Structures are given as C-alpha cells and as structure tokens.
Design a protein around this ligand. Structure first.
Ligand SMILES: Nc1ncnc2c1ncn2[C@@H]1O[C@H](COP(=O)(O)OP(=O)(O)OP(=O)(O)O)[C@@H](O)[C@H]1O
Ligand SMILES: Nc1ncnc2c1ncn2[C@@H]1O[C@H](COP(=O)(O)OP(=O)(O)OP(=O)(O)O)[C@@H](O)[C@H]1O
Ligand SMILES: [Mg+2]
Ligand SMILES: [Mg+2]
Lengths: 119, 136, 134, 118
C-alpha cells in the first residue's frame, strides 16, 4: 500500500535510532524499511538501533534479511541492536535463523533503552 | 472431499502480500488456527519470493503459479516458475545457502518451509523452471 | 499488473472469489461503490458459470482473469461448461433457463449497468467467456 | 456454514419478519430460501417484512429469493415489505423493477404500520 501494508516510524535519541513497525514485514515492505533506515544512517551518526515490533502483523525471511543488514551496519560502529515487543510468531523466526545469538531481545522499548545505557 | 484453487500473477513484489492472503483465505475453510494460518502464509511468501527474486530477477513479466488442492483435511500447495532455475538443487537445500547476498538474502527460505510443513519437495531443471510442493 | 484465479465450482467459494478480485483491484484505489459493483458483477458472472455452465457440479472449474492497465480493469470469467445456445436471447432482460431454482434473470442486466462494457462469447458444450471492462 | 449471512426470523401474528446480516448471494440466498419456505409450511403466514439494515451485499440471487417469497405471499393475499434498505440494494430493486411489487419502508416500525400491525 505504499506503506499501508506497513508503517514505519523513526526517532533518534542521541546516538540511537528507534524503529517502530506496524503491519506486515515481507519482501516488498522490508525493502522500503531498508531504504529509510540506511538513509538515516548516512545522514546521522547512529550507534544503536532499537526495533519495536509491538504492532507487527507478519514477518517473513525478508524481515530477517533487513534486520541482519542493519546489524552489520551497527556492528562496525561498535553498537548494539535491540528488538522489543516481539510476538511469539516473530520470536520463532529469530530462533531458527539463530538471529538471537546476534540480536538482544527485550520486553518493551524502555527495557531496550536501558540495555543501551540510555535510560 | 476436495476443493481446489489456482492463482497466477505477475512477478511483482506488490502482489506478494495479496497472494499469501488469498491462499490463507482459501485454506481458512479447514478452520485452522492462527498459528497454522501464519505458517502457511509465511510458507507461501517464502516460496513466492523465491520465484520472484531467484527465477525472474525482480522482473515482472514473469508469472508465479500457486495451486491449492485441499482434500480430506490436507492442504496440498504448489508453486511454479518459468524463469531461471536451480543448478544444484540439493546444494540449495543446504542451510543458509544463498545466491543473493548483495540483496541481503539469508538462506532461510527452505529451512522455514521444512519446519512449517510436514513435507517439502522441490523439483527443478535449469532454464526450464522450478516447482515447490508443500503438504500439511 | 495481472492476476488469474481458478477454483472448483462450489457455491462455498463464491464469496472468496469476489473478495479476492476486489482485493487485487483495490490497487487502483477505487470507491466503495466502485468496488461494490465489481464484487457484485464477479458474483453475478461466477454464479452463472456454476449453476448454468456446470449445473452445480463442483468438479467444474471457474476461471477469473483480471488484467489491470492504464486505470482500466479488464475482467474475464470463463468456464468450460455447457455453453449458451441463443446468446441474443439470454441477453433479453428477465430471461432465464432455471426458474425452478428461482433465478430472476437479472444477471447480464446488472453486469451491463455496473460495467462500461460486457461481451459474452460462447459455443455450446464447449463452455463460455464473459468479458467486462471498467 | 452460516457465518457468511446470519438470518434472524420472528413470527408476529400472521407476519414473518426476516432480518438479514451479511452478504446475500447465490450460496447464501439458497439457505435463506430454505429457512423461510420451511416456516411457511409450518405456519399460516400472510405477510413478510424483510429487514435489510445490516445487509452488506446482494446480487441477483437476492432478488430471486425475494421474488420467490413474494409469489408465496401473493398467493394468500398478503404483502411483502422491505425496510432499512441501503442505496446499493435500493439500486437493484430499481433495475429489476422489484419495487412495482414490493413496498419499501424506512424501517421495521413503519413496515409493521403498513401491514396494519402497529
Ligand atoms: N524458484 C527458484 N528459482 C531459482 N532458484 C531458486 C528458487 N527458489 C530457490 N532458489 C535457490 O535456492 C537458494 C535458496 O533458498 P532460500 O530459498 O533459503 O534462499 P534466499 O532466498 O537466499 O533465502 P531467504 O529466504 O532467507 O531470503 C537461493 O539462494 C536460490 O539460489
Ligand atoms: N456460463 C453460462 N453457461 C451457460 N448458460 C449461461 C451462462 N451464463 C448465463 N447463461 C444463460 O443466460 C441466461 C441469463 O442470465 P441471467 O444471467 O440473467 O440468468 P439467471 O441466472 O437466470 O438470472 P439471475 O442473475 O437473476 O440469477 C441464463 O438464464 C442462462 O440460461
Ligand atoms: Mg528465499
Ligand atoms: Mg445469474
């Protein structure tokens, strides 16, 4: 839907980029996310990313792809990426890809910010 | 008894959501659970995306064909591909393997299909096409 | 952008079919009315195929195509069913061959009023095709 | 197999009230036809009031089942009244010219008044 089928929300808290997702995260949609995020990383010195999946309706391997791509971006700058408000459906995919061994998970945004020494 | 649906559509990423939702709709007749449905939609999306990114390289003139033959409570799903194919299918069957890293693909596609379905048969001949059969 | 959908001729698939169609066409951001007409038209033509074309026999298959281009919705419904003997006669308002099933004979009339065009091609025992444009 | 159209029926003296919720199509119109003709066999119904307020969709199968029900009511010297009709539906009553044979009312109280019940 031109972001309907998804809805991306971004906010920088000092050196941290928060990405809040609402909708389905698939090939079509994960490409748009990638475009907006990589765009913010070029324009600002972002060290950490927090990904709020609380309102996420769906996710496929296209969702894992864009997440790892973002982690490698964050990895080089010596940062951390934290996902929060993850539903079981989505948590499951993190278990197969073994994405967890590289991405910290938290209950909500506040605990993700605490994990990044911001709060 | 049986009921069957077939869906074809241009290989564009804006149709993907549409396709898996359509399949999930038809399957809904077997009163599945939200998890059962989620796995199928995930699976459809996984296979359909394979056809679109690895058969037709994002090119839309291609056609993806999904077949859903339901019978005696079983869902027999299939996907097609008159585009480029898999030269070493068995090697593709290897966890994490991908042709597209510039496109950030992680090689999960099949691993996901195998874990969500009771069966996964991938047939293919190069330059001819690719056909993934899933059962649940 | 194009979509194609086939399915066994069971009355239980009719809603699914027209909803599927409306979902694909929605990409042209139509109105609720514009959508309502399309779904009705689809329902009108698909029902014809099932009751007439296959005589409520589920083994039959209804084929719906939707080719969208330059803002135009090219909808086609086909069936390899019984076919239509006199088409110039079926096109007659209030005409029906299934009054035992309480069919009012309003189908083509509706399709006519909802669509900017309606072409019904057919040969007996072969099946049929109904092409609508909006 | 009924969640595509919910059918609510109620008999008030010699009047049958049919309130519809959902879509009224081929599949669905056949189930309506069955429950209604069934009530007509078990009870001496002269009038029918069709409340279309919550109706989401209707095709020619809707007209058909309504027309068949009129002929049933015509036979006993009765009247059929539809009420709370949406524009979309009203439009179809205009083509079939179903109006020439079916009275239309604002809604269920006025339908009942037209039938001298209230
Ligand atoms: N329809 C197809 N046509 C041609 N090659 C295919 C097709 N489907 C899969 N493949 C090949 O199988 C390999 C693997 O599968 P997966 O499906 O796991 O891949 P990805 O697409 O690389 O992974 P992911 O699903 O995580 O993005 C692909 O990299 C691709 O080369
Ligand atoms: N797919 C088809 N195969 C064979 N005959 C058909 C087909 N579609 C329509 N017809 C014939 O054309 C006549 C026309 O149409 P309409 O569509 O007006 O019919 P009904 O189905 O009789 O009416 P209603 O739409 O009120 O149910 C039908 O009565 C039927 O005999
Ligand atoms: Mg894949
Ligand atoms: Mg008809």
């Amino acid at each position: 839907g031109s972001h309907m089928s998804l809805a991306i929300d971004l906010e920088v808290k000092q050196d941290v980029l928060i990405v809040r997702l609402s909708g389905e995260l698939d090939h079509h949609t994960a490409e748009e996310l990638r475009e907006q995020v990589t765009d913010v990383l070029e324009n600002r010195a972002i060290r950490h990313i927090v990904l709020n999946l609380g309102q996420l309706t769906f996710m496929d391997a296209s969702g894992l792809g864009v997440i790892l791509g973002r982690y490698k971006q964050i990895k080089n700058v010596g940062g951390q990426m934290v996902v929060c408000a993850v539903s079981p459906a989505v948590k499951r995919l993190f278990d197969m890809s073994g994405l967890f061994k590289i991405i910290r998970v938290e209950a909500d945004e506040q605990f993700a910010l605490q994990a990044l020494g911001v709060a | 008894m049986r009921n069957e649906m077939h869906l074809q559509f241009s290989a564009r990423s804006e149709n993907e959501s549409f396709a898996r939702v359509t399949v999930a709709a038809f399957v809904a007749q077997l009163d599945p659970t939200m998890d059962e449905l989620t796995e199928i939609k995930t699976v459809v999306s996984e296979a359909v995306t394979n056809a679109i990114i690895h058969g037709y390289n994002n090119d839309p003139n291609g056609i993806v064909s999904i077949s859903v033959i339901i019978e005696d409570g079983v869902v027999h799903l299939t996907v097609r591909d008159e585009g480029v194919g898999i030269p070493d299918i068995e090697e593709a069957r290897q966890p994490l393997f991908t042709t597209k890293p510039e496109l950030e693909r992680s090689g999960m596609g099949f691993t996901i299909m195998e874990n969500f379905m009771d069966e996964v048969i991938v047939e293919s001949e190069v330059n001819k096409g690719t056909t993934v059969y899933l059962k649940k």
